[PDB]
Copies of this chain bind each other. A is one copy, B any other.
Amino acid sequence: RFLKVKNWETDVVLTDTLHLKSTLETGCTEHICMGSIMLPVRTKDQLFPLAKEFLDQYYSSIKRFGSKAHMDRLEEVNKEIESTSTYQLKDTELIYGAKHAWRNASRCVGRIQWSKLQVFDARDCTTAHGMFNYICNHVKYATNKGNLRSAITIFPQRTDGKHDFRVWNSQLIRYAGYKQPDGSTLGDPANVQFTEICIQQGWKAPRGRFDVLPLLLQANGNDPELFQIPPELVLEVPIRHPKFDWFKDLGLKWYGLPAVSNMLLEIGGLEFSACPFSGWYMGTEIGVRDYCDNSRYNILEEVAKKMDLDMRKTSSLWKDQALVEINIAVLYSFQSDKVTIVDHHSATESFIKHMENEYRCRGGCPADWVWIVPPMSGSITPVFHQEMLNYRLTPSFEYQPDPWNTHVWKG
């Protein structure tokens, strides 16, 4: 079967065959679409077919499908599974798997970059201190003094689910949030729960509005341990506006390195529960979501007051006016400090080229419109007008429950 998608701005039509290789389920049925739903201990039984399919993919990509190297690897993995109940990926396979998990990430607009991913193998790590060392090296490498480089660090895979490696931080670099007795929040409201865990674990909170959270690292299923990222490794950008001199006095900054650390990396049926990865920011992630979500720093009103817009009627679009200026400031500040950032116009245009290229060389590109379209100025970006097909391919990044909800404490 074949499936067509149309760009309604350009009339370019693309044909998807790649969805045929999709096995995992979407959440939708013939009778309900769950496309806007945020989120809709594995035995040898199901593992060898997952390994075989991955190794077929791997050896096909290197033009060795059916070779003796391919057949020998299949044999070797089979015997390792039935004898040890799991198996170890070769370095080349791990790198391939991590790159393709990114390539397959249908919610990621930044995938044109997928093949230039730096993969750090941390599968020999055994302790939380070792994890901290690997993560520091990741941050330093990825940050590269502002010339950001994509990277992923891969800690040992799950064994029986009782010895998991986990990074308890949702991102490697994030600001604390503190609930005050008067009901207000200081810092990032998204991080109040995690901040409280850190404090309970012994973290001495500075209780400011932009406190970089400590790392909370769990090795081999043991209780997690606290570590402070060396401050010289945390590149931050003070936010100023190119026309509004009062904007700096808002006291805003952000960190340069977006580094997601709570997802699970699935490769050939193996589960890597700690696999922090990093790229560089699209400006709206900070300017629209981090700063202007009502549930986050929520600076629209203070910015709009300082711009002296008509704030009495929403049809003045004072929120839309302030939002644009804030996002101009974020982009101006990062570029002025020579920290890598991409605006949503450039990013979505690159994604369309990537997607067309993927349809030609690969037969498709799974894409989640709900997430790909940026959270401001949607229809003046080319992705808004692009039909997209969403389906799940493996290798993949998956969500996993927050570890404090599942962890068995040792004491």
Which A residues are closer than 8 A to B by beta carbons? Answer: 3, 5-6, 8-9, 19, 22-23, 25-38, 283, 288-289, 292-295, 300, 314-317, 319-321, 323-324, 327-328, 331, 335, 343, 345-346, 368-370, 373-380, 384, 386-392
Query: Chain B residues with Cβ under 8 A from A6's Cβ?
Result: 38
Query: B314 to A390, Cβ gap below 8 A?
Result: no
Separation of A404 and B69 alpha carbons in the complex (Å):
60
In the complex, the chain B residue whose C-beta lies closest to that of A23 is: B31
Query: Chain B residues with Cβ under 8 A from A320's Cβ?
Result: 324, 327, 376-377, 380
Separation of A391 and B300 alpha carbons in the complex (Å):
35
In the complex, the chain B residue whose C-beta lies closest to that of A289 is: B379
Query: B380 to A319, Cβ gap below 8 A?
Result: yes
Query: A31 to B19, Cβ gap below 8 A?
Result: yes
| Interface-centre pick from A35, A320, A378, A389 (highest chain B CB count, 10 A) | A320
Give the distance to chain B from A287, nearest Cβ to Cβ, in Å: 9
Known: A9-B295, A31-B19, A32-B389. A300 touches B26 (CB 8 A): no
Query: A36 to B387, Cβ gap below 8 A?
Result: yes
Query: Chain B residues with Cβ under 8 A from A283's Cβ?
Result: 315
Separation of A8 and B346 alpha carbons in the complex (Å):
28
The 8 residue pairs across chains A and B that have the minimum distance between CB atoms = A35-B35, A375-B379, A28-B28, A36-B369, A314-B345, A33-B390, A315-B343, A25-B30
Query: B369 to A35, Cβ gap below 8 A?
Result: yes
* A331 touches which of B31, B300, B317, B327 (Cβ 8 Å): B317
Query: A26 to B30, Cβ gap below 8 A?
Result: yes
Query: B26 to A391, Cβ gap below 8 A?
Result: no
In the complex, the chain B residue whose C-beta lies closest to that of A386 is: B36
Query: B319 to A331, Cβ gap below 8 A?
Result: no
Query: Chain B residues with Cβ under 8 A from A319's Cβ?
Result: 345, 377, 380
Chain copies in complex: 2
Separation of A343 and B19 alpha carbons in the complex (Å):
39
Separation of A294 and B379 alpha carbons in the complex (Å):
9
Query: Chain B residues with Cβ under 8 A from A36's Cβ?
Result: 35, 369-370, 386-388, 390
Query: Chain B residues with Cβ under 8 A from A389's Cβ?
Result: 32-34, 37
Separation of A32 and B32 alpha carbons in the complex (Å):
12
Separation of A86 and B278 alpha carbons in the complex (Å):
63
Separation of A345 and B25 alpha carbons in the complex (Å):
35
Q: Can you list 23 A-B contacts with CB-CB less than 8 angstroms, sorted by A residue number?
A: A3-B32, A19-B32, A22-B31, A23-B31, A25-B30, A25-B31, A26-B32, A26-B33, A28-B28, A33-B35, A33-B391, A36-B388, A288-B380, A289-B379, A314-B343, A315-B345, A316-B328, A317-B328, A320-B380, A321-B324, A324-B324, A373-B378, A374-B378
In the complex, the chain B residue whose C-beta lies closest to that of A343 is: B315
Give the distance to chain B from A32, nearest Cβ to Cβ, in Å: 5
Separation of A346 and B320 alpha carbons in the complex (Å):
13
Extra inter-chain contacts (9) besides given A25-B30, A36-B388, CB under 8 Å? A28-B29, A28-B30, A33-B33, A33-B389, A36-B390, A315-B331, A321-B328, A376-B379, A376-B380
Query: A317 to B327, Cβ gap below 8 A?
Result: yes
Separation of A243 and B5 alpha carbons in the complex (Å):
42
* A5 touches which of B31, B37, B294, B369 (Cβ 8 Å): B37
Query: A343 to B331, Cβ gap below 8 A?
Result: no
Separation of A19 and B28 alpha carbons in the complex (Å):
12
Query: Chain B residues with Cβ under 8 A from A9's Cβ?
Result: 293-295
Query: Chain B residues with Cβ under 8 A from A292's Cβ?
Result: 379-380
Separation of A323 and B379 alpha carbons in the complex (Å):
10
Separation of A133 and B8 alpha carbons in the complex (Å):
35
* A390 touches which of B5, B22, B35, B376 (Cβ 8 Å): B35
Separation of A254 and B341 alpha carbons in the complex (Å):
38
